[PDB]
Coordinates of N, CA, C and O in Angstrom, one line a residue:
Chain U
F391 N 24.4 -30.9 39.1 CA 23.1 -31.5 39.7 C 22.1 -30.6 39.0 O 21.9 -29.7 39.1
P392 N 21.0 -31.5 39.0 CA 19.3 -30.9 38.7 C 18.8 -30.0 40.0 O 19.3 -30.5 41.1
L393 N 17.9 -29.4 39.4 CA 17.1 -28.4 40.3 C 16.2 -29.3 41.1 O 15.9 -29.0 42.5
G394 N 15.7 -30.5 40.6 CA 14.8 -31.3 41.0 C 15.4 -32.3 41.9 O 14.9 -33.0 42.8
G395 N 16.7 -32.8 41.4 CA 17.4 -33.7 42.0 C 17.0 -35.2 41.6 O 17.7 -35.9 42.2
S396 N 16.3 -35.4 40.8 CA 15.8 -36.7 40.4 C 15.1 -36.4 38.9 O 14.2 -35.6 38.6
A397 N 15.5 -37.5 38.1 CA 14.5 -37.7 36.8 C 14.1 -39.0 36.6 O 14.7 -40.2 36.2
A398 N 12.8 -39.6 37.5 CA 12.7 -40.6 37.7 C 11.5 -41.0 36.8 O 11.1 -40.9 35.9
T399 N 10.9 -42.4 36.9 CA 9.9 -43.2 36.3 C 8.8 -43.0 37.1 O 8.3 -43.1 38.2
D400 N 7.5 -43.1 36.3 CA 6.2 -42.8 36.6 C 5.4 -43.5 38.1 O 5.3 -43.2 39.0
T401 N 5.2 -44.8 37.5 CA 4.3 -45.4 38.1 C 4.7 -46.8 38.9 O 5.6 -47.6 38.3
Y402 N 4.6 -46.9 40.1 CA 5.1 -48.2 41.0 C 4.2 -48.8 41.6 O 4.2 -50.3 41.3
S403 N 3.1 -48.7 42.5 CA 2.2 -49.2 43.0 C 2.6 -50.4 44.1 O 2.4 -51.6 43.7
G404 N 3.1 -49.8 45.3 CA 3.7 -50.8 46.0 C 2.7 -51.8 46.6 O 1.5 -51.4 46.5
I405 N 3.0 -52.7 47.2 CA 2.6 -54.1 47.3 C 2.3 -54.7 48.6 O 3.1 -54.3 49.6
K406 N 1.3 -55.7 48.8 CA 0.8 -56.2 50.0 C 0.8 -57.5 49.6 O 0.5 -58.0 48.7
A407 N 1.1 -58.5 50.9 CA 1.2 -59.9 50.7 C -0.1 -60.8 50.8 O -1.0 -60.3 51.3
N408 N 0.1 -62.1 50.1 CA -1.0 -63.1 50.3 C -0.2 -64.4 50.1 O 0.3 -64.8 49.0
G409 N 0.1 -65.0 51.1 CA 0.8 -66.2 51.1 C 2.3 -66.4 50.8 O 3.1 -65.5 51.1
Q410 N 2.5 -67.0 49.5 CA 4.1 -67.1 49.3 C 4.1 -66.0 48.4 O 5.4 -65.7 48.3
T411 N 3.4 -65.5 47.7 CA 3.7 -64.2 46.8 C 3.0 -62.7 47.4 O 2.2 -62.8 48.1
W412 N 3.6 -61.8 46.8 CA 3.2 -60.4 46.9 C 2.1 -60.2 46.1 O 1.8 -60.9 44.9
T413 N 1.1 -59.3 46.1 CA -0.4 -59.1 45.2 C -0.2 -57.7 44.6 O 0.3 -57.5 43.6
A414 N -0.3 -56.8 45.6 CA -0.8 -55.5 45.0 C -0.9 -54.3 46.3 O -0.6 -55.0 47.6
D415 N -1.3 -53.2 45.9 CA -1.5 -52.6 47.4 C -2.8 -52.6 48.0 O -3.7 -53.5 47.5
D416 N -2.6 -52.6 49.5 CA -4.0 -52.7 50.3 C -4.1 -51.7 51.0 O -3.4 -51.3 52.1
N417 N -5.0 -50.8 50.7 CA -5.0 -49.3 51.2 C -4.1 -48.6 51.7 O -4.0 -47.8 52.6
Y418 N -2.9 -48.8 51.0 CA -1.4 -48.1 51.4 C -1.0 -47.1 50.3 O -0.9 -46.0 50.7
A419 N -1.1 -47.6 49.1 CA -0.1 -47.0 48.0 C -1.0 -46.5 46.9 O -2.0 -46.6 46.7
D420 N -0.5 -45.3 46.0 CA -1.2 -44.9 44.9 C -0.4 -45.4 43.8 O 0.5 -46.1 43.7
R421 N -0.9 -45.0 42.7 CA -0.4 -45.1 41.4 C 1.1 -44.2 41.4 O 2.0 -44.9 40.6
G422 N 0.9 -43.3 42.1 CA 2.0 -42.2 42.1 C 3.2 -42.8 43.4 O 2.7 -42.9 44.4
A423 N 4.3 -43.1 42.7 CA 5.5 -43.3 43.9 C 6.7 -43.4 43.0 O 6.6 -43.4 41.8
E424 N 7.8 -42.5 43.5 CA 8.8 -42.0 42.7 C 10.1 -42.5 43.8 O 10.5 -41.8 44.5
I425 N 11.0 -43.2 42.7 CA 12.7 -43.3 43.1 C 13.0 -43.2 41.6 O 12.6 -43.6 40.8
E426 N 14.3 -42.8 41.8 CA 15.1 -42.6 40.6 C 15.9 -43.9 40.3 O 16.6 -44.2 41.5
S427 N 16.0 -44.5 39.2 CA 16.8 -46.0 39.1 C 18.2 -45.5 39.0 O 18.6 -44.5 38.1
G428 N 19.0 -46.1 39.9 CA 20.7 -45.6 39.4 C 20.7 -44.6 40.5 O 20.3 -44.2 41.5
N429 N 21.7 -43.5 40.0 CA 22.0 -42.4 40.4 C 21.5 -41.2 39.9 O 20.6 -40.9 38.8
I430 N 21.7 -39.8 40.6 CA 21.2 -38.6 39.9 C 21.9 -38.5 38.7 O 23.0 -38.3 38.7
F431 N 21.2 -38.1 37.3 CA 21.7 -37.8 36.5 C 22.2 -36.2 36.5 O 21.4 -35.2 36.5
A432 N 23.7 -36.3 36.5 CA 24.5 -34.9 36.7 C 25.2 -34.6 35.2 O 24.8 -35.0 34.2
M433 N 25.9 -33.5 35.5 CA 26.7 -33.2 34.4 C 28.2 -32.6 35.0 O 28.2 -32.5 36.0
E434 N 29.1 -32.1 34.1 CA 30.4 -31.9 34.7 C 30.9 -30.7 34.0 O 31.0 -30.2 33.0
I435 N 31.4 -29.9 35.2 CA 32.4 -28.7 35.0 C 33.7 -29.1 35.6 O 34.0 -29.5 36.6
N436 N 34.8 -28.5 34.7 CA 36.2 -28.5 35.4 C 36.7 -27.1 35.6 O 37.2 -26.2 34.7
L437 N 36.0 -26.5 36.8 CA 36.0 -25.2 37.2 C 37.0 -24.4 37.4 O 37.2 -23.0 37.0
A438 N 38.0 -25.2 37.8 CA 39.4 -24.5 37.9 C 40.1 -24.2 36.7 O 40.9 -23.1 36.6
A439 N 40.0 -25.1 35.9 CA 40.7 -25.2 34.6 C 39.8 -23.9 33.6 O 40.5 -23.2 33.3
Chain N
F391 N 22.7 -23.5 32.5 CA 21.8 -23.0 31.4 C 21.9 -23.9 30.3 O 22.8 -24.1 29.5
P392 N 20.8 -24.5 29.5 CA 20.9 -24.9 28.1 C 21.1 -23.7 27.0 O 21.0 -22.6 27.4
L393 N 21.5 -23.9 26.1 CA 22.0 -23.3 25.0 C 20.9 -22.4 24.4 O 21.1 -21.0 24.6
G394 N 20.0 -23.0 24.0 CA 18.8 -22.2 23.5 C 17.9 -21.5 24.4 O 17.3 -20.7 23.9
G395 N 17.9 -21.7 25.8 CA 17.0 -21.3 26.7 C 15.7 -22.1 26.6 O 14.9 -21.0 26.4
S396 N 15.6 -23.1 26.5 CA 14.4 -23.8 26.2 C 14.4 -25.2 26.9 O 15.5 -25.9 26.8
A397 N 13.1 -25.9 27.2 CA 13.4 -27.2 27.8 C 13.6 -28.3 26.8 O 14.7 -28.8 26.8
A398 N 12.8 -28.4 25.7 CA 13.2 -28.8 24.4 C 12.5 -27.5 23.4 O 13.2 -26.7 23.0
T399 N 11.2 -27.9 23.2 CA 10.2 -26.7 22.4 C 9.0 -27.8 22.6 O 9.1 -28.8 22.5
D400 N 7.8 -27.3 22.2 CA 6.8 -28.0 21.6 C 6.3 -27.2 20.5 O 6.7 -26.2 19.9
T401 N 5.0 -27.6 19.7 CA 4.4 -27.3 18.6 C 3.6 -25.9 18.7 O 4.0 -24.8 18.0
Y402 N 2.6 -26.0 19.3 CA 1.6 -24.8 19.6 C 1.3 -24.3 18.2 O 2.0 -23.2 17.9
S403 N 0.5 -24.6 17.5 CA 0.0 -24.2 16.0 C -0.6 -22.8 16.3 O -1.3 -22.5 17.2
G404 N -0.9 -22.0 15.4 CA -1.3 -20.9 15.4 C -2.8 -20.5 15.1 O -3.5 -21.4 14.2
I405 N -3.5 -19.8 15.9 CA -4.9 -19.7 16.0 C -5.0 -18.2 16.0 O -4.7 -17.3 16.8
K406 N -6.2 -17.6 15.1 CA -6.6 -16.1 15.3 C -8.2 -16.3 15.7 O -8.8 -17.5 15.9
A407 N -8.8 -15.1 15.8 CA -10.2 -15.2 16.4 C -11.2 -14.7 15.1 O -10.9 -13.8 14.3
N408 N -12.2 -15.5 15.1 CA -13.2 -15.0 14.2 C -14.5 -14.9 14.7 O -15.5 -15.0 14.1
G409 N -14.5 -14.2 16.1 CA -15.6 -13.6 16.6 C -16.5 -14.7 17.3 O -17.5 -14.8 16.9
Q410 N -16.2 -15.2 18.2 CA -16.7 -16.5 19.1 C -16.1 -17.8 18.4 O -16.3 -18.7 19.2
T411 N -15.4 -17.8 17.3 CA -15.0 -19.1 16.5 C -13.5 -18.7 16.8 O -12.9 -17.6 16.6
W412 N -12.7 -20.0 17.2 CA -11.5 -19.8 17.1 C -11.2 -20.9 15.8 O -10.9 -22.0 15.9
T413 N -10.6 -20.1 14.9 CA -10.1 -20.5 13.3 C -8.6 -20.5 13.6 O -8.1 -19.7 14.0
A414 N -8.1 -21.5 13.0 CA -6.4 -21.3 12.8 C -6.0 -20.4 11.8 O -6.4 -20.2 10.8
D415 N -5.1 -19.7 12.6 CA -4.6 -18.4 11.6 C -3.7 -18.9 10.5 O -3.1 -20.1 10.5
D416 N -3.9 -18.3 9.4 CA -2.9 -18.4 8.5 C -1.5 -17.9 8.2 O -0.6 -18.8 8.1
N417 N -1.3 -16.8 9.2 CA 0.1 -16.2 9.4 C 0.9 -16.7 10.3 O 2.2 -16.4 10.3
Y418 N 0.5 -17.5 11.3 CA 1.1 -18.4 12.2 C 1.3 -19.9 12.0 O 1.0 -20.7 12.9
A419 N 1.6 -20.1 10.7 CA 1.6 -21.4 9.9 C 2.0 -22.5 10.8 O 3.0 -22.4 11.9
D420 N 2.0 -23.7 10.2 CA 1.8 -25.1 11.0 C 2.5 -25.2 12.3 O 1.9 -25.4 13.2
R421 N 4.0 -25.5 12.1 CA 4.8 -25.6 13.3 C 5.8 -24.6 13.3 O 6.9 -24.5 12.8
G422 N 5.6 -23.5 14.0 CA 6.5 -22.6 14.7 C 6.9 -23.1 16.0 O 6.1 -23.7 16.9
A423 N 8.4 -23.0 16.1 CA 9.1 -23.3 17.5 C 8.7 -22.7 18.7 O 9.5 -21.8 19.2
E424 N 7.5 -22.7 19.1 CA 7.0 -21.8 20.2 C 7.5 -22.0 21.4 O 8.7 -22.4 21.7
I425 N 6.9 -21.2 22.7 CA 7.2 -21.2 24.0 C 6.8 -22.8 24.5 O 6.1 -23.5 23.9
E426 N 7.5 -23.1 25.5 CA 7.4 -24.4 25.7 C 6.4 -24.7 27.2 O 4.9 -24.9 26.8
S427 N 6.4 -23.9 28.4 CA 5.9 -23.9 29.4 C 6.9 -23.5 30.5 O 8.1 -23.3 30.3
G428 N 6.2 -22.7 31.7 CA 6.7 -22.8 33.0 C 8.2 -22.0 32.8 O 8.2 -20.7 32.6
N429 N 9.2 -22.7 33.0 CA 10.6 -22.1 32.4 C 11.7 -23.1 32.1 O 11.0 -24.3 31.6
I430 N 12.6 -23.0 32.5 CA 13.9 -23.9 31.6 C 14.3 -24.9 32.0 O 14.5 -25.0 33.5
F431 N 14.6 -25.8 31.5 CA 15.1 -27.1 32.1 C 16.7 -26.8 32.5 O 17.5 -27.1 31.6
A432 N 16.9 -26.2 33.5 CA 18.0 -25.8 34.1 C 18.5 -26.5 35.0 O 17.8 -27.5 35.6
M433 N 19.9 -26.2 35.8 CA 20.5 -27.1 36.6 C 21.3 -26.4 37.6 O 21.1 -25.4 37.8
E434 N 22.1 -26.8 38.4 CA 22.8 -26.5 39.5 C 24.1 -26.9 40.1 O 24.4 -28.0 39.9
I435 N 25.1 -25.6 39.9 CA 26.4 -26.1 40.4 C 26.4 -25.5 41.7 O 25.6 -24.4 42.4
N436 N 27.2 -26.1 42.6 CA 27.6 -25.1 43.8 C 29.1 -24.6 43.5 O 29.9 -25.6 43.6
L437 N 28.9 -23.6 43.1 CA 30.3 -23.1 42.3 C 31.6 -22.6 43.5 O 32.6 -22.7 43.2
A438 N 30.9 -22.0 44.6 CA 31.9 -21.4 45.3 C 32.5 -22.8 46.4 O 33.6 -22.9 46.9
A439 N 31.6 -24.0 46.3 CA 32.2 -25.3 47.0 C 33.3 -25.7 46.4 O 34.1 -26.6 47.2

């Protein structure tokens, strides 16, 4: 497993509603927000072998 | 730990001192595979687990 636990993508800017569609942030979110798409990028050891 | 002991590498071209002027050094020419930053793009086992 990685030491940081994630290798994610940069910018999200979570959003707020207006009618039928969502628009953009309304004094909540920043350009910075981080989640990793899919799972944590790992690697493999066969340690008993 | 990765094989080379480096994140990847970056360029960091060579510069000597000209006495208040920073001129590029001849001896430390264009692209030596220099230091990267920080520390190594390393990972984590729980090996006893």
